Amino acid sequence: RLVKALEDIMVHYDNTTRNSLGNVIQFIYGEDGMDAAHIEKQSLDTIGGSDAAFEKRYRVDLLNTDHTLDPSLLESGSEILGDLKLQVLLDEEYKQLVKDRKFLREVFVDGEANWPLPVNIRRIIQNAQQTFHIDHTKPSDLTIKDIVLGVKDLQENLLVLRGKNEIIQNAQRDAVTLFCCLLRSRLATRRVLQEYRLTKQAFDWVLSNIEAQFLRSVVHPGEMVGVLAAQSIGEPATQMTLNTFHFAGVASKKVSGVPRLKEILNVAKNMKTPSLTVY
Amino acid sequence: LRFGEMERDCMIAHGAASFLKERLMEASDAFRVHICGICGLMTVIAKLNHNQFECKGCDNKIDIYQIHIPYAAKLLFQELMAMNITPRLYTDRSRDF
Amino acid sequence: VSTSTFQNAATLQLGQEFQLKQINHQGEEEELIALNLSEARLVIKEALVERRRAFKRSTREKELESIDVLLEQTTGGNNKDLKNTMQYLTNFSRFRDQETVGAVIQLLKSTGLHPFEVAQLGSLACDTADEAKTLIPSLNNKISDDELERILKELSNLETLY
Amino acid sequence: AGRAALYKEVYNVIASDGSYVNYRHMALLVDVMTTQGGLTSVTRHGFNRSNTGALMRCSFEETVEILFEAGASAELDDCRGVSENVILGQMAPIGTGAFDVMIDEESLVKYM
Amino acid sequence: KAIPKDQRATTPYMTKYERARILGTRALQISMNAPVFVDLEGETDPLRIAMKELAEKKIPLVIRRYLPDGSFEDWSVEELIVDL
Amino acid sequence: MFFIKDLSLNITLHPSFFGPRMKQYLKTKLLEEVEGSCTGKFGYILCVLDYDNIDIQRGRILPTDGSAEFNVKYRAVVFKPFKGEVVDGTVVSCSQHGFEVQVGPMKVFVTKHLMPQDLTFNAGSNPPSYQSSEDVITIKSRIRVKIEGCISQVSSIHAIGSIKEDYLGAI
Amino acid sequence: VGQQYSSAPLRTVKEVQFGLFSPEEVRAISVAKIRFPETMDETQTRAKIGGLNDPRLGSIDRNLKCQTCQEGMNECPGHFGHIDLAKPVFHVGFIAKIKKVCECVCMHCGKLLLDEHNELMRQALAIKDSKKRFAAIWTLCKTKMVCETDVPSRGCGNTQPTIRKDGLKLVGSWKELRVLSTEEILNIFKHISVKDFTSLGFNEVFSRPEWMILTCLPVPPPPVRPSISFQRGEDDLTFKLADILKANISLETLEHNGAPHHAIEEAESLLQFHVATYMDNDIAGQPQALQKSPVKSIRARLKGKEGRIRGNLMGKRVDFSARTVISGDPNLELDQVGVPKSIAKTLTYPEVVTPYNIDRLTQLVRNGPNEHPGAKYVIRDSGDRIDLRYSKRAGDIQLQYGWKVERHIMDNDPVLFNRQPSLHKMSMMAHRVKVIPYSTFRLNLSVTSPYNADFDGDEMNLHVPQSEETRAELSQLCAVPLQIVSPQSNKPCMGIVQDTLCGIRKLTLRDTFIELDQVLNMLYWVPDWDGVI
DNA sequence: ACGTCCCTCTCGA
RNA sequence: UCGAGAAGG
Ligand SMILES: [Zn+2]
Ligand SMILES: [Zn+2]
Ligand SMILES: [Zn+2]
């Protein structure tokens, strides 16, 4: 029943997900426009933790003596302490990082940080250190405005939908939001120098690799997500209901499941175990 | 061996369209029917080793087309016709949309 | 595969294809292309001279044989029709020269009569307007018998010294 | 709002055995049911009544029945569906059939 | 009959289905004594020859991507990006 | 008459042709089919006009077949007769029932009934001819005929004419 | 050779326009009138009969050409005939909608019961839909049992009955009960206004309501109702058509010579029934016609699960296919499958004779169909098949380009491999061929879980392409290495299992050590070993 | 009014 | 060549 109801649906050449009639089901497949194989459970370090540890890890204050970057973490360190025209960009960065933490706490209200997202950043900075042999005793050769500006310019090129009018541009802005919030979380200025110990070449190589692996992770117009989605729950249901352990009474309500799959699909107003969860 | 509905779906998910046609047309069925440009149904007399095409009823010797479809579909359309249903096969579109 | 396009009596009641308003090859309502025997003989000749020049990149009833050898070069001998056509055209053309033909077209195409009438009037030599309107039936009231004979006499002088 | 509760119920039965399925597949089926105005069932009456092609709808549950209303109400088939080309032995607009391949004569002389 | 080559929305990257059909089409064609534009390095298989044509980007093919409404965006093999 | 029509036609090429004189063999195969061809719609398609500026358009590659189809666009000189037009021609045949007339690529036949009453016939003539009071229709004379009716015979549209009405016959 | 060549231009179907047959169009396309309910029974001898089966329909015998298109069995599609019915007759699948139209039109004048003045009807006729408009009219018209004279004109204004069916025909009651005959409703439907029936839910040229009542029935050609040789034996649908003509040819002589009211009304409901069970033999009431047994109606021919659509068009039994018991192999590579020698010598792929393989193909052709690297047939450019297994010229046969060599499938060929559950697209992948002995499909150990296959008697399907395009299709899209990371769960679906998994734990311990002699053997067992100790 | 998927064999008019 | 039964993953 599933497969016969979804086969029509596929990703068309403008990233719309339509049937034979041309009726739109999804404006970007998976609400982000990404192929399912290229996605791995990543960690958003900006949502979880105390606000106190948040400053320790992301805040950089050039207008300070304790909360500034030590000139041992990078070359332009003493010539950068108190740089007013640069600390404005440090504030612009940390103002976006705080917007992220509140924005993520809106979507994932329970405090969950591990979610599937394309491009494994933790592996890229791992291979960067392993490739360029980064010395955690000598300082980095990056300016403050190399990192934050290179990250901002990287987001402009992480493309899902190409278009002209603001309709597409504003929906494209939405399609990347999460991955950008993780990108900002993993390429904060403090992180890049204090614990990543990156160099200029290594950090450019990381940006170039993030741009490429992302452009690969995008769906390919022609993917038969219709039958693919139907199959994706088909094989599990053929398993499932592997009977084990007893407990009746409520019987854990719809623990249905295999007849709820029946119940859910044909809807049917007569429910087998209705239950109001009043908070 | 049966290449059934279950197996059809996996090729669809794979996107192997050209193969799915081959596995369903060159590996079975396939037929060279002659259909009328007027009524899209298989009335044309195909006197081809004499070169003479015609469709009596809607008399025409000029608007005839060759189409490659499974013989099980030719059978199906002829079966629907014996039930008084006309499944007209047209070699062009009009809906657009 | 047979010929496609884009879209019966001499009483202006021509075919559905051969109606006055017909589509240009680019796509505009253009008038139909009717051409008399002289207007024809020349158009085929100039298109066959064009073809001889492209394959390179790699007086009196005696032009009959010079056109006959051109047809043996430009097109295959598998076309007895174009051979029979050019023989008929050069033997039945009223005007041999490009200038005289164009001048004929000037006189004919100002009256605003149907293209097929234009073609059939440059092909058939008539004297009396009663003779003209009878061989081409579609006229009758379209042109004054004096005005028609005014054209006929103008056209008779414009005839090539055959 | 009903859309989210629909996904919530189907996520609960799949994750009842750990399993896990990527959001996109379930949200596809959920949106498919949703994007109509209301809840459309996944049976012979719920989605098969759609204005799609006759030849792909008869291949589900109600076969000869639909083909009879097709001749009666004088339907016309778009053929843009999957199961239509299958019945017709035609290369479907699926994946490798979602485009057409041409040759540029300019390129043919460009590459000697 | 509608599209311009400067107003292009579809992704500049070649899809896996585009590559798979282009390769098969060229391989099928080479198998039918078609002229090979690439320099042949001693290959008996037309699929490898088609892959060599794709590597040197010497395939005269051009994709016509049909959008849902009926529009079509022409992309030559030459200009499509092959990452994948 | 004689007309110039904006026709079109679709040719299919085998993949072995895809390279050099591609544009040329398509032009060549277009002539090989449409030249001297006769259809019931347009009549004698005689000469393909302006060989140089001939459109080719792109060629769609077939599905499981490697061939490619091209919608070729062209302009041509056509000749479709009509019931009522008067045409002049040269006599060709001469039989007991009448005589044929070569009007261009097409043969029109006149019946002894479709000739006036003063027209007699002389079979014992060298060459056989149709005599009359003052005129004689020899085996190769030039005659003005009115086409009375046309019939489409495969690839040769034939006709039947008259010279009985006024202003027809002599030259 | 397959099928001959026809000059007709080839295209593809792009619109399938469903309509209804007009009994004039049936009479126009039909070859001859089917009048005798006999097959070859002229005198049961060599020929058929000019009445049914090949009275210009299509050949019945193998060594005989068609009476119309003299082309014979393969390539001859079969041509339709017809039976002129002695009296009009309802249709089975339309008997419901035929009733529903009378519940809307005037049974005297033919106009709509509620035209273009009543408010709710005009909200309904404005619905420019399809059967959704037909549903609104039928409900808002069935109630009114009269017409109108004007009301601020529209005709007449007679009374309408309460019409409900009785298995086969319709009856309506005025207030007096009266049976509504087929011929009666036929006249009512033909008088329905051109604007009325179109706005009802029909079509001016494709589906007129008067064509739901059959006046002339199309006789299908022999292909859909064949003849078996058990000195023959026809099909059930051939039997059913003889029954229809038998009920018809009676009703003709009844209504001509005789004139009994009960007898003519008798054999009419019989013909009404034989035309009914011919299409569907599973009706509401109805005895469900049996012939010396039930009978397979045309609806049962098209019914799901099998019946053309589900079993012959959405799924096909196919050539170039294999199936055998599967066994496991740790020394085989992941993306390849072990194919028995027997299967490779049976399955073939047709390679176009090209200057690349010509020397390799000539070697294979002259090898033979029983030697492993060989070929079974070679197909000339002349479109004829040369059986290398029997032909006299098989030993020499000089090859030419543009020919085809149906050569045995050999090592590292793309094939399709399939387990029978077939639920995920990971249950059907492409494998390299590695021709092996013994009668089992020997596949790799780790591509176990994606197929869900063990080796306790498991059996698996193998399919092999035939074109170079669909080889690329399998190798570039459906290959096993591509499928390693599944989209269904964003994680890989293949892994190290059983002995490889138990041993990799027993090996990766600090307690585990290996000495010089055995270390060297392990290193050489690695295919991509750098040669460095 | 639907009521999984393919396989191998053997019995009856 | 249609209907009934047994059996494998
Ligand atoms: Zn027709
Ligand atoms: Zn036949
Ligand atoms: Zn009335």
PDB file of C-alpha atoms in Angstrom, chain B:
ATOM      1  CA  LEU B   1      12.053 -16.003 -13.461  1.00  0.00           C
ATOM      2  CA  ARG B   2       9.490 -13.468 -12.272  1.00  0.00           C
ATOM      3  CA  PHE B   3      10.605  -9.842 -12.047  1.00  0.00           C
ATOM      4  CA  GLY B   4       7.633  -9.012  -9.868  1.00  0.00           C
ATOM      5  CA  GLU B   5       6.165  -5.864  -8.366  1.00  0.00           C
ATOM      6  CA  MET B   6       8.455  -6.242  -5.346  1.00  0.00           C
ATOM      7  CA  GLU B   7      11.518  -6.226  -7.610  1.00  0.00           C
ATOM      8  CA  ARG B   8      10.156  -3.397  -9.774  1.00  0.00           C
ATOM      9  CA  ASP B   9      10.221  -1.008  -6.805  1.00  0.00           C
ATOM     10  CA  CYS B  10      13.927  -1.473  -6.040  1.00  0.00           C
ATOM     11  CA  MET B  11      14.892  -0.425  -9.576  1.00  0.00           C
ATOM     12  CA  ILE B  12      12.600   2.606  -9.226  1.00  0.00           C
ATOM     13  CA  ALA B  13      14.334   3.560  -5.973  1.00  0.00           C
ATOM     14  CA  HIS B  14      17.666   2.967  -7.713  1.00  0.00           C
ATOM     15  CA  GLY B  15      16.578   5.120 -10.653  1.00  0.00           C
ATOM     16  CA  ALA B  16      17.585   2.455 -13.198  1.00  0.00           C
ATOM     17  CA  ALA B  17      14.960   3.502 -15.726  1.00  0.00           C
ATOM     18  CA  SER B  18      16.674   2.339 -18.925  1.00  0.00           C
ATOM     19  CA  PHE B  19      17.337  -1.043 -17.313  1.00  0.00           C
ATOM     20  CA  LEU B  20      13.782  -1.410 -15.991  1.00  0.00           C
ATOM     21  CA  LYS B  21      12.479  -0.915 -19.526  1.00  0.00           C
ATOM     22  CA  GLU B  22      14.956  -3.475 -20.878  1.00  0.00           C
ATOM     23  CA  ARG B  23      14.139  -5.955 -18.100  1.00  0.00           C
ATOM     24  CA  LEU B  24      10.434  -5.535 -18.993  1.00  0.00           C
ATOM     25  CA  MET B  25      10.516  -5.178 -22.801  1.00  0.00           C
ATOM     26  CA  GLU B  26      13.558  -6.946 -24.239  1.00  0.00           C
ATOM     27  CA  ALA B  27      13.338  -9.718 -21.613  1.00  0.00           C
ATOM     28  CA  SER B  28       9.626 -10.424 -22.330  1.00  0.00           C
ATOM     29  CA  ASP B  29       6.536  -9.120 -24.166  1.00  0.00           C
ATOM     30  CA  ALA B  30       7.368  -6.323 -26.711  1.00  0.00           C
ATOM     31  CA  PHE B  31       5.345  -5.909 -29.911  1.00  0.00           C
ATOM     32  CA  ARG B  32       5.222  -3.782 -33.071  1.00  0.00           C
ATOM     33  CA  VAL B  33       1.637  -2.520 -33.216  1.00  0.00           C
ATOM     34  CA  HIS B  34       0.353   0.005 -35.753  1.00  0.00           C
ATOM     35  CA  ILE B  35      -2.091   2.534 -34.312  1.00  0.00           C
ATOM     36  CA  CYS B  36      -4.205   5.135 -36.085  1.00  0.00           C
ATOM     37  CA  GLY B  37      -3.434   8.829 -35.777  1.00  0.00           C
ATOM     38  CA  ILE B  38      -7.180   9.499 -35.544  1.00  0.00           C
ATOM     39  CA  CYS B  39      -8.447   6.890 -33.081  1.00  0.00           C
ATOM     40  CA  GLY B  40      -5.579   5.769 -30.882  1.00  0.00           C
ATOM     41  CA  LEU B  41      -6.337   2.063 -31.196  1.00  0.00           C
ATOM     42  CA  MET B  42      -4.919  -0.832 -33.165  1.00  0.00           C
ATOM     43  CA  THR B  43      -7.125  -0.979 -36.270  1.00  0.00           C
ATOM     44  CA  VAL B  44      -4.426  -0.359 -38.882  1.00  0.00           C
ATOM     45  CA  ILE B  45      -3.933  -3.130 -41.416  1.00  0.00           C
ATOM     46  CA  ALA B  46      -0.173  -3.600 -41.735  1.00  0.00           C
ATOM     47  CA  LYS B  47       0.457  -5.039 -45.201  1.00  0.00           C
ATOM     48  CA  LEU B  48       4.133  -4.209 -44.803  1.00  0.00           C
ATOM     49  CA  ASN B  49       5.881  -6.669 -47.156  1.00  0.00           C
ATOM     50  CA  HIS B  50       3.631  -5.043 -49.784  1.00  0.00           C
ATOM     51  CA  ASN B  51       3.764  -1.543 -48.253  1.00  0.00           C
ATOM     52  CA  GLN B  52       0.088  -0.623 -47.818  1.00  0.00           C
ATOM     53  CA  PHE B  53      -1.262   0.891 -44.587  1.00  0.00           C
ATOM     54  CA  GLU B  54      -4.916   1.761 -44.027  1.00  0.00           C
ATOM     55  CA  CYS B  55      -7.522   2.104 -41.274  1.00  0.00           C
ATOM     56  CA  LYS B  56     -11.056   1.452 -42.493  1.00  0.00           C
ATOM     57  CA  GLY B  57     -13.803   3.160 -40.529  1.00  0.00           C
ATOM     58  CA  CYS B  58     -11.832   6.386 -40.192  1.00  0.00           C
ATOM     59  CA  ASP B  59     -10.332   5.909 -43.642  1.00  0.00           C
ATOM     60  CA  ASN B  60      -6.731   7.107 -43.725  1.00  0.00           C
ATOM     61  CA  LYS B  61      -3.517   5.842 -45.308  1.00  0.00           C
ATOM     62  CA  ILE B  62      -1.218   8.648 -44.099  1.00  0.00           C
ATOM     63  CA  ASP B  63      -1.518   9.115 -40.306  1.00  0.00           C
ATOM     64  CA  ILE B  64      -0.316   5.783 -38.930  1.00  0.00           C
ATOM     65  CA  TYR B  65       2.268   5.259 -36.197  1.00  0.00           C
ATOM     66  CA  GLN B  66       4.404   2.373 -34.997  1.00  0.00           C
ATOM     67  CA  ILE B  67       4.678   1.970 -31.227  1.00  0.00           C
ATOM     68  CA  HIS B  68       6.674  -0.426 -29.048  1.00  0.00           C
ATOM     69  CA  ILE B  69       4.637  -1.705 -26.086  1.00  0.00           C
ATOM     70  CA  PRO B  70       4.339  -5.006 -24.208  1.00  0.00           C
ATOM     71  CA  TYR B  71       2.100  -7.566 -25.871  1.00  0.00           C
ATOM     72  CA  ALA B  72       0.395  -7.940 -22.487  1.00  0.00           C
ATOM     73  CA  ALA B  73      -0.656  -4.303 -22.888  1.00  0.00           C
ATOM     74  CA  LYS B  74      -1.885  -4.861 -26.451  1.00  0.00           C
ATOM     75  CA  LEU B  75      -3.835  -7.770 -24.981  1.00  0.00           C
ATOM     76  CA  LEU B  76      -5.100  -5.523 -22.175  1.00  0.00           C
ATOM     77  CA  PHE B  77      -6.273  -2.777 -24.544  1.00  0.00           C
ATOM     78  CA  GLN B  78      -7.998  -5.325 -26.785  1.00  0.00           C
ATOM     79  CA  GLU B  79      -9.583  -6.781 -23.641  1.00  0.00           C
ATOM     80  CA  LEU B  80     -10.894  -3.362 -22.593  1.00  0.00           C
ATOM     81  CA  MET B  81     -12.243  -2.900 -26.129  1.00  0.00           C
ATOM     82  CA  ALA B  82     -14.291  -6.109 -25.954  1.00  0.00           C
ATOM     83  CA  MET B  83     -15.787  -4.381 -22.890  1.00  0.00           C
ATOM     84  CA  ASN B  84     -16.698  -1.357 -25.100  1.00  0.00           C
ATOM     85  CA  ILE B  85     -13.955   0.902 -23.643  1.00  0.00           C
ATOM     86  CA  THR B  86     -11.773   2.919 -26.026  1.00  0.00           C
ATOM     87  CA  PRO B  87      -8.238   3.412 -24.672  1.00  0.00           C
ATOM     88  CA  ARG B  88      -6.993   5.791 -27.355  1.00  0.00           C
ATOM     89  CA  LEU B  89      -3.197   5.893 -27.666  1.00  0.00           C
ATOM     90  CA  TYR B  90      -1.944   9.319 -28.751  1.00  0.00           C
ATOM     91  CA  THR B  91       1.651  10.031 -29.791  1.00  0.00           C
ATOM     92  CA  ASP B  92       1.513  13.673 -28.623  1.00  0.00           C
ATOM     93  CA  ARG B  93       0.287  15.720 -25.663  1.00  0.00           C
ATOM     94  CA  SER B  94      -2.233  18.478 -24.989  1.00  0.00           C
ATOM     95  CA  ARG B  95      -2.513  18.856 -21.201  1.00  0.00           C
ATOM     96  CA  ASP B  96       0.819  20.681 -20.704  1.00  0.00           C
ATOM     97  CA  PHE B  97       0.579  21.905 -17.083  1.00  0.00           C
TER      98      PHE B  97
END
